Every structure is written in C-alpha cells, then in structure tokens.
Amino acid sequence: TEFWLISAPGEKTCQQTWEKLHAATTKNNNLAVSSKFNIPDLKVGTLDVLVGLSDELAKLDAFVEGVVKKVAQYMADVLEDSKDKVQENLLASGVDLVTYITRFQWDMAKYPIKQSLKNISEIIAKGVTQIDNDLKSRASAYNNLKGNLQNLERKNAGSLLTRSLAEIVKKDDFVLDSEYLVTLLVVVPKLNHNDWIKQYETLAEMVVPRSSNVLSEDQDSYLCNVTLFKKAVDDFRHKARENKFIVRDFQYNEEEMRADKEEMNRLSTDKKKQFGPLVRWLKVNFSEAFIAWIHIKALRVFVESVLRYGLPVNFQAMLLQPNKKSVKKLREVLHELYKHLDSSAAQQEYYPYVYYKIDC
Amino acid sequence: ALSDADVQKQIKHMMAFIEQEANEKAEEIDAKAEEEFNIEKGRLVQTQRLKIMEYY
Amino acid sequence: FVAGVINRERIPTFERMLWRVCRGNVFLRQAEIENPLEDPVTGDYVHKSVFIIFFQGDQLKNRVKKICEGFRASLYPC
C-alpha cells in the first residue's frame, strides 16, 4: 500500500486541478486517485533555519517511521486488529489508514499554527519520543510475561518420561507416613508394561509384592507407583534401570504442585488482563504515531517547497494513490509537466517537484 | 543550469529571503525592546522608591 | 564564492550539487583563465575555469564548504 505525495510550485490556480481534475493532463489521465493535502500556514525565518529543519525533519521522519512500524509489528505479534497477511495496519484517527491518508488532516490540536516550525518539530519529536518509550517499555514487560507463560507451558508439557507430574500424581498414589516404606514412581515403556508389573515385585530385596499399580499412561510408557522399603530404593532403582525402566525423581509434594497450578492460572489471567489494556494502549499509540508520521511528511513538504520555490509559500500539494503498473507513466507525465522549473536539480529521489512516498 | 531569466529569478528569491529575515529580526528587536522597557522601568523606579522609603 | 582554479572537471556537476543542496539561492561567480597556471597537485599546466557560489546562510555555507572540499575545486580565498 504505497501513496505518492507531491507538490508543485503553484504559480497558477490550474495547479489545484491539474494534479487531480485535469483528465487531459492529470494522473493516468485522471485514473489515479488524488486528494487535497491540508497544510498549516507556518512562519519561516531565513533559509538556513529551513535547511536545518529539513535535515532535522528527515531524521525525525526516519525515526518515527521506524517507531510506528515497530509498534505495528508489536501489535501483529499481539495478533489484535492487525495481522501480517490481513489487517496490514491499524486505524488512525479512528479510521483505516486508507481513509486516514485519503482524508488526512493537520492536527492543529498538537501543533498550534501560531508557533514557529522549530517549536512544532520539537513538539512532535517529543510526542513521538514519549510514545516510543512508553510502548517500548510496555511491550518489553508484556513479552517477559509471554515468555514466562510459555516457559511454564513447556515445563508442564511432554510425555510421562519428562512431563511435570503436578497434574498426574495424587496423594493416593504414594504410600505416606510410613516408617520403612517410600513410594517411587517409575516409567515402564508400554511394550514392557506387563514385564514391569511382573518384574517390579522381584527387582530388589524387601519390596511389597502386588502393590504396583498405574498412575498414568501415555503413548510410549506407563507411570507406575511402587511402595518399598527405604533402604532397598537404591537396589530398586538400580535394577529397574538394568531392566530398562526409568524412575522419576519425584516425591509427593502438595505445596509445589499447588504453587505451579496457581502460578500458571495467575499468569494466564495476567496475560488476558494485560491483553485488554495492551490493545487499547498500542492502538492509541499507533493512531498517534501514524498521525504524527504524516504530520512530519507534511512538514517535509512545507520545508522543501519553500526552500526550492521561495516565498510567498503558495504551493499546490496533492496526494496520489498510484494504480498498478502506472508508475512509469506517472513519472513521465510529472517530468514533462514540471521539468522546466529545475532541468537538473531533480532516479532514486530527485524529481522536478516535491515528492515523498508513503509506505503502508 | 540557468538562463539569464532564471539567474534573475534566483536572485529575486534570495532578495526575498533577505527581506523576510530582516523583517523578522526587526519585529523581534521591537518586541524585546518593549519587554526591556517594562523590566528596566521597574528596576529603576522600585530601586529609588525603596531608597526614598528608607530615608522616610 | 571565489574565482578559483578548477579544470571544469566537476563544475558542470558542482552547480547541480549546489542546486541539490538549495535551489541556487545565490548566483555563482564565473571566470576563465587564459594560459592557466600549472596546478601544484597536477604538477603540470591545465586550463582553469572557476564557477563558485557564495551563500549568506550558515548551514548552507557549511554545506558548500563540504562540497568544495569533496569536489575538485580551489577554495581558500580570503
């Protein structure tokens, strides 16, 4: 979604229509969509200040463009009102970007027209700077939450060989409050499930026969609990390993499992609670970033137009919505229409008129 | 890159910038003059009124 | 700016570079040297032709300084 922003010297009033309405001469013979660009009438002093401003604005432009695209990607990562294949951008001014740009207005609320450009630029720069820091910090904190939540999901992921037992083991799975006995959980591949049941009773001296049962099963193995004499556990786990059974390092612990369950429940709720305010925060920041973005471009237009054509500052600036495969024709038309003013001052960027691209 | 007509145009443009700059500078000068008017008037009159009050 | 010593190697582009920085806000001074002097860097005698712009703006004067430094031009007239 690319739009072209241009400005003509405006010597004659026909320029208002030549850039829009003159089907005989206008864009793709009046096939490209164009609209009026609303610009404030601001004060200029000497040409060197304008030169400074031009440099400053080019830098501010690049900065904000980066910031607004970054935050757009942040929301893409959030997956709310903007995706990479659909919903390519967010609303600006409460309208879609296509609508915003097409009916783009100067935000005099933020940039009073009675101020000098230096101050206007400084004000915008400060706004977008604050927005950048606010959302960078917020996004980082959110990403850290997402990180920890995924970390817990992974911790509670996997098969019985590695999966956390918080959701598997019950108090009724362990032999508790025994003086001599401990209950161990061992994973026996399902192919050898009966062998475990047959073999566990004879793996070590002084084990409790017929005590073996199954706590859980998965596609590869069964997790079984066995109660045994504490001192035989070394022989039990040793010989179990010899018969290719894997014992888990687990003992019943109500507090750790409860803590894990609530921590996951809390982090998921926290994710939802931040999401709520996340999308409102980021969408507002986007809106403002996009508004400022175009405001910056408008100022770049003002500065270049005045710098090249002099004052009074009456120029005919217009927006185009290029049509597919007509870029060449539009450039040829614009060149023939305006080449006589510069002949050589303005490939990669230099045209005989004020020209910027909008990358959407 | 310029014909005589365009050289003249470029000069007219510079002259325009010269005029705009001078106009702005003078306006700034008069505004500051008025601020200084009120500030110095205050300094002086308050200073001597104080001296008078002390003598009084 | 100054009627210096240039072979008119990049002056055709010097002027355009100036137009690129600002729209030719000030006229340039032109000169041509008959039987030019032997350029010290060249070590031999080449025709010299000068087209240099003077600016009143400081940002742009500094810009021109940088261009003149980068381009094959003679600039240090007082």
CSV table of N, CA and C in Angstrom, one decimal, chain A residues 47-49 51-52 307-309 344-345, chain C residues 16 19-20 22-23 25 57-60:
chain,number,residue,atom,x,y,z
A,47,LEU,N,16.8,31.2,5.3
A,47,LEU,CA,16.8,29.9,4.6
A,47,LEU,C,17.6,28.9,5.3
A,48,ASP,N,18.6,29.3,6.1
A,48,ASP,CA,19.4,28.4,6.9
A,48,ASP,C,18.6,27.7,7.9
A,49,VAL,N,17.6,28.3,8.5
A,49,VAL,CA,16.9,27.6,9.5
A,49,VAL,C,16.1,26.6,8.8
A,51,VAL,N,17.0,25.0,6.2
A,51,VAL,CA,17.9,23.9,5.9
A,51,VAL,C,18.1,23.0,7.1
A,52,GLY,N,18.2,23.6,8.3
A,52,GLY,CA,18.4,22.8,9.5
A,52,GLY,C,17.1,22.0,9.6
A,307,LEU,N,11.9,26.0,0.4
A,307,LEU,CA,13.3,26.0,0.1
A,307,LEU,C,13.6,26.0,-1.3
A,308,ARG,N,12.8,25.4,-2.2
A,308,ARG,CA,13.1,25.4,-3.6
A,308,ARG,C,12.4,26.5,-4.3
A,309,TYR,N,11.2,26.9,-3.9
A,309,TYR,CA,10.4,27.9,-4.7
A,309,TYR,C,10.4,29.3,-4.1
A,344,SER,N,17.7,20.3,-13.9
A,344,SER,CA,18.7,19.4,-13.4
A,344,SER,C,18.9,19.2,-11.9
A,345,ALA,N,18.2,20.1,-11.1
A,345,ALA,CA,18.3,19.9,-9.7
A,345,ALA,C,17.6,18.7,-9.2
C,16,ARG,N,25.1,21.7,-10.1
C,16,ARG,CA,23.9,20.9,-9.9
C,16,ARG,C,23.9,20.5,-8.4
C,19,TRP,N,22.5,23.1,-6.6
C,19,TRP,CA,21.0,23.2,-6.8
C,19,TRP,C,20.4,22.2,-5.9
C,20,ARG,N,21.0,21.0,-5.7
C,20,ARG,CA,20.6,19.9,-4.9
C,20,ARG,C,20.6,20.3,-3.4
C,22,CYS,N,20.4,23.5,-2.2
C,22,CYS,CA,19.4,24.6,-2.1
C,22,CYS,C,19.1,25.0,-3.5
C,23,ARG,N,18.0,25.7,-3.7
C,23,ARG,CA,17.7,26.0,-5.1
C,23,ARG,C,18.4,27.2,-5.5
C,25,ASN,N,20.2,29.5,-4.3
C,25,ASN,CA,19.9,30.7,-3.6
C,25,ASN,C,20.8,31.9,-4.0
C,57,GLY,N,23.5,32.0,4.2
C,57,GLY,CA,23.1,31.1,5.2
C,57,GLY,C,24.2,30.3,5.7
C,58,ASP,N,24.2,30.0,7.0
C,58,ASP,CA,25.4,29.4,7.6
C,58,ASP,C,25.4,27.9,7.4
C,59,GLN,N,24.2,27.3,7.5
C,59,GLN,CA,24.0,25.9,7.4
C,59,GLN,C,24.5,25.5,6.0
C,60,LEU,N,24.1,26.3,5.0
C,60,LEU,CA,24.3,26.0,3.6
C,60,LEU,C,25.7,26.4,3.3
